Paper text:
Throughout this process in yeast, endocytic coat adaptors, Sla2 and Ent1, must remain attached to the plasma membrane to transmit force from the actin cytoskeleton required for successful membrane invagination. Here, we present a cryo-EM structure of a 16-mer complex of the ANTH and ENTH membrane-binding domains from Sla2 and Ent1 bound to PIP2 that constitutes the anchor to the plasma membrane.
The global resolution of the final EM map is 3.9 Å (gold-standard Fourier shell correlation threshold 0.143) with analysis of the local resolution showing higher resolution towards the core of the map, reaching 3.7 Å. The cryo-EM map shows that each A2E2 tetramer contains three distinct lipid-binding sites, harboring 5 lipids per A2E2 with a total of 20 PIP2 lipids resolved in the entire 16-mer complex. A second interface in the AENTH tetramer involves residues K10, K13, and K14 of ANTH. Altogether, these results indicate that lysines of the ANTH-ENTH interface 2 are essential for the assembly of the tetrameric lipid-binding AENTH unit and for the AENTH function in vivo. Our tetrameric structure suggests a mechanism of lipid locking as the anchor unit to the membrane that would enable force transmission coming from actin polymerization for invagination to take place.
Author numbering:
A (entry chain N), C (entry chain D), E (entry chain B): 1 to 212, 222 to 256
B (entry chain M), D (entry chain A), F (entry chain C), G (entry chain H): 1 to 147
């Protein structure tokens, strides 16, 4: 450990706060703004490995919300270290064995993150947390269109798992009836990725459609799920306030 | 009244330079929209390469600042928006290099009952400001006309 | 409402505090000590009727813990007003309809209180919250021993429902796994009544046994449940601290 | 200046609710008249069984207060007059059911502060206020127009 | 005695201090407001026995004022307890016979109070401290007209005793030139009563006379005695620094 | 040291009688077990029927008191236990009439990590003290010998 | 008013015994002639041979005292005059042994324009008091009747 890591460690205690209220944007921001300042993210993972993490399941779900926001928002190093350490993330999926209801939310989030990180390592020449329309990756994909079809169908396989996990969170919210705040906070980064992945398939599909059929029928089902998910979020009386529309 | 005396006392105690006291008096909790004469004075001062850091380092303190003072973050985003439109190119090069400080604000949130309205002013200024850094043809057209 | 009720109303907000931590002994004491000072308890029920009570199930279970401690600890008026208003207590059993797990704890507590208050009104010439060995009621019962047998068998029917409800709380504790504090607090007054009812049957049974068979076999099952319940409480790492032994 | 800070510290120490701090800032030794926006906010608050207790409990503390603070008592009687005309039926039922603290104030007397006799302001307010509670037909007329 | 009674026992200790000024008004408010809060007043009469009396006459002189105010202002129980404890009030007149600068005044409160309580017990079915228009009891008094004539003409003999008691204290103030501060205070309960008793008889005399002559001459003699009292109390103008202006 | 000056300042400000200052200095947060000479002085003072209330009303404040000062409640239970053993019968008649103030303490609880040990001293003194009020043959034997 | 709070603060700070605080509150700059009940209480207290020195040593401070407080010297001469008439013989034996403290006052003088009138009250009390110590047949007749 070193004195610059101590500045970040103050924020990580407060972002993984002791109970099932939201992880404050102020402490998640302090980690993200650190991750850009120090150009690299080994300190943030080395902190999560040495944290009182697996002490109880409420803080371990908070840690997965915070860790998703840091990979998504942060410098490209946050994702590059997550591509290396996806097996540490996978180990978190084991440490509470799916018993009481709150543990099932953890296991489906770990399966989602391990799928996302597997997909960045395996498939794309693209390394941003949120997806965005990288022109060189799009041009090289449409120039290779049988792999281009595999790219939209594999990227759709993430949007399928994103959608299935959103229904786990919604059913778990509705069956518990009260203390929603951390569960709905977990919907916030999934909302931003849901729009980011949607914008990427839309822009890649447009490019491939003009550069050249059935992907439009698949796109209508994914678009139907997108508009269903934002209607489902519109019901949620806190979550709706802050995002300036779940787009 | 006493907060105006106390604020002047804290500005002595910490020893802030007159350029810092101009910024930290300009982007402050008095909640009157920031004055058009102060904005053009900061844009002129920005051309002094020694005194430049005093303006931008105080705006980095005010953008970093606690949630209780959403007022600071809104005015600091206003002062930056003027400085990229009408200040020196050195303010754009600084603001481009550490864009993340603003870009992370887009999701900012404060509450006191109805406080979501205060979060909205922060969020819309951060969104407009990142749209202005990202539209390079807008920003170089805007700067060529404004200079 | 009147200015002396305002002194009690401050304590009742804090004893029914907004979430699933314990009801503080300091605020429950302020209500009990009021109830002895003003010799009467109509203000405490009139406050619970006008409270933001049925706003959410967490505060309604807290209110039933506090209301049990006030009937049990407080002046004989607290029980006499509860004997009149057992139908208001019964209405609380309806207001959350047994859905999410926390509501089932409320319905079994309301059934227990309505059974206790039915038993004081129906059966005994005895009006203390905790039971204790009232000599005149014991002498008049042993002087009437077919009703004496019905008295110990009916008082045993309360200890049966006390024991069945304790297993609802223990299973609900173990299935939820965490945030036990209000549920174990609900065990505290049930523990004091479990010993108080046990001391009364033991003292009444001794008196009736010497004043004159199968009630000793029933007593061994009730005693076995008593020693089982205090072993079950001994597991509980907070509750054990304060009672100076669950006797 | 010293009292404005020290009262803000005593508000933290006793732990006061935002409802108590409003009522408390409204009824305070401060020589300023109680402002119309403060009176109408306490009337607007009255339609809540969770806040109405805190409002009437703080006014009942301030109506009790020592002779040194006749300034509290004078404002507290002002707030009660406004609350019975503007406010919820609970304000009237409360004030009718413990009238005796208002009717007993009617003899109040602080004296030789600088030489003058200082109670008459309390005694005129308490006399007309107790008359207005007793004139149930004047009060229900007044309420029905203003509501 | 119980803990709530400690509130009142502090206040009467400050009202019955060793200073020969008035009882401070704030302590008499504490005794009146206690009497209204607890809806029953027996603790005030008990506390008045517990106090050391006669041994320094400033305690007994003020204590008789304080008790007169409490009977007049307080909850109707203060009148009901005074109707019983009239024999203790009579004992206060005996205990310091002669042997004082003002024992005639001490006895003149006792004589006045005993006659006041005699009237409250027999001559009406009402129960209030300051005499006032009880609506049904007024209608009964015209229904039973000669008992109403005896009620008001005896109440006038009380008002003549109230006025002769005021002349006694005025003459004693003409004697106590060097030290007067409390003798004006002894007038204070008499003044407020003298206007209320005037209102009560004026209304009852007019309603009786018109519905059913020299009772108009009796009425004017009492009208003139009020103006004689209002002039006399204005001459002792230091009294105005305690009270309102007398009216 | 400064808490001993400040405590003497609060004893002036509230204006407490010398008998109250004896009790509120005796049962205080200095945590030395209460002095045997002070206990017998309170037991002698108890026979003055005017000065009696000053002792017992301060012990009612100290038994009522916040959880932070478990120290007060423990010593106040000690001072009462001495006063029923060796003080006037008037202390027993008072303590019998409002037994509930102590009897409710038997379940008392405070925590700071290990603070359950501090709750234990309060609970055992409340339990012994209620056992002493309830054993009438013990208390009249004990008082007959002690007087 | 504040001099009454400040005087009570100085009486705490120096730590004066309750018998000293009785004398130093009795013979003080409030300029109301000293109370007849306080004089007889000092005359009764004088019979306690331990507590005697606290009265007489404070009167030695007040007779010694600065010219600005002629008020102290006049009342201290009054308190001594009562104490030789109606107090213990121990006050006469003390006052006889150090007569010079009073006897030197006969020529005392203070001035603020008209302040010669204030010097006159000191001088006449010192002269009457030394006439009373010197007339032994007067003082033993006076004491025999007064006792
Ligand atoms: O507000 P306040 O009048 O209390 O001023 C803050 C505080 O009192 C200290 O002066 C500073 O902390 P430190 O002395 O730096 O520890 C702090 O620095 P910064 O928060 O203004 O930077 C001040 O803000
Ligand atoms: O609240 P208060 O009235 O005590 O004053 C504000 C705050 O407390 C700090 O004094 C300043 O924080 P910082 O120094 O800006 O961190 C802030 O600066 P500015 O609002 O006066 O500019 C003050 O407004
Ligand atoms: O003092 P105060 O009452 O204002 O509370 C602290 C601070 O002043 C702000 O209120 C909070 O900042 P923010 O409003 O949360 O930004 C901060 O929250 P956290 O940062 O300490 O949690 C508090 O610690
Ligand atoms: O000045 P000072 O030091 O005496 O403080 C005032 C007074 O002593 C009480 O502390 C306050 O009343 P309370 O303690 O709230 O009853 C009062 O509230 P407010 O006068 O500031 O409103 C204070 O002003
Ligand atoms: O004020 P201050 O701090 O000097 O305290 C005064 C005095 O000590 C008592 O508190 C009150 O007298 P009492 O105890 O009521 O006699 C008196 O109340 P009030 O008479 O000044 O209002 C107070 O003024
Ligand atoms: O603060 P501190 O602890 O020095 O003294 C408390 C507080 O400051 C006020 O003096 C009292 O409140 P209030 O002035 O009575 O409102 C309070 O009365 P009580 O808590 O000592 O009784 C004091 O304890
Ligand atoms: O803590 P602190 O050092 O400020 O002093 C204690 C406390 O704060 C109050 O001053 C007193 O409360 P109370 O006046 O006893 O309510 C208490 O009385 P005592 O402990 O000094 O007796 C003090 O000890
Ligand atoms: O100031 P502080 O930090 O000491 O907190 C308040 C008080 O002084 C005690 O700490 C608490 O009493 P207790 O320790 O809970 O008895 C009290 O709890 P609650 O009574 O306000 O909840 C607090 O309000
Ligand atoms: O100033 P003030 O008049 O408030 O009190 C005097 C002075 O301040 C010191 O307290 C004492 O001097 P020292 O501390 O003894 O030097 C002096 O002793 P004494 O003059 O009262 O005896 C005090 O009178
Ligand atoms: O003048 P001030 O108002 O500051 O108070 C007087 C004087 O200053 C000293 O405080 C006392 O002198 P000492 O202590 O008597 O020497 C004197 O005693 P006492 O006049 O209050 O008795 C005070 O009156
Ligand atoms: O301070 P101040 O303005 O009161 O002057 C000093 C002192 O307080 C008296 O005024 C004088 O005593 P006195 O009035 O002269 O007795 C004394 O005169 P001296 O003794 O210092 O000359 C002065 O030193």
């Amino acid at each position: 450990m070193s004195r610059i890591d101590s500045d970040l460690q103050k924020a990580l205690k407060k972002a993984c706060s002791v109970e099932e209220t939201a992880p404050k944007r102020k402490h998640v921001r302090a980690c993200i703004v650190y991750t850009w300042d120090h150009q690299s993210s080994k300190a943030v993972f080395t902190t999560l490995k040495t944290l009182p993490l697996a002490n109880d399941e409420v803080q371990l779900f908070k840690m997965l919300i915070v860790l998703h926001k840091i990979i998504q928002e942060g410098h490209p190093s946050a994702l590059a270290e997550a591509i290396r350490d996806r097996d540490w993330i996978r180990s978190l999926g084991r440490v509470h064995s799916g018993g009481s209801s709150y543990s099932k939310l953890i296991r489906e989030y770990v399966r989602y993150l391990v799928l996302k990180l597997d997909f960045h390592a395996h498939h794309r020449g693209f390394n941003n947390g949120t997806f965005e329309y990288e022109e060189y990756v799009s041009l090289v994909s449409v120039s290779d269109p049988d792999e281009g079809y595999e790219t939209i169908l594999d990227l759709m396989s993430l949007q399928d798992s994103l959608d299935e996990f959103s229904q786990i969170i919604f059913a778990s919210i509705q069956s518990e009836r009260r203390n929603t705040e951390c569960k709905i906070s977990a919907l916030i980064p999934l909302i931003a990725e849901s729009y980011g992945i949607y914008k990427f398939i839309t822009s890649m599909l447009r490019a491939m459609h003009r550069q050249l059929q059935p992907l439009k029928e698949r796109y209508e089902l994914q678009h139907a799920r997108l508009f269903e998910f934002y209607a489902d979020c519109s019901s949620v009386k806190y979550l709706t306030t802050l995002v300036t529309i779940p787009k | 009244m006493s907060k105006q005396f106390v604020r002047s006392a804290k500005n002595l105690v910490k020893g802030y330079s007159s350029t810092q006291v101009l910024v930290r008096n300009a982007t402050s909790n008095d909640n009157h929209q920031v004055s058009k004469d102060s904005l053009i004075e900061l844009a002129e001062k920005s051309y002094d390469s020694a005194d430049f850091f005093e303006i931008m380092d105080m705006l980095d303190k005010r953008l970093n600042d606690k949630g209780k003072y959403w007022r600071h973050i809104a005015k600091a985003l206003t002062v930056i928006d003027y400085l990229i439109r009408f200040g020196s190119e050195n303010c754009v090069l600084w603001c481009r290099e550490n864009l993340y400080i603003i870009k992370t604000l887009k999701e900012f949130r404060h509450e006191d009952d109805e406080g979501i309205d205060q979060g909205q002013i922060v969020r819309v200024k951060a969104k407009e400001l990142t749209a202005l850094l990202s539209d390079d043809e807008r920003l170089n057209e805007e700067r060529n006309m404004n200079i």
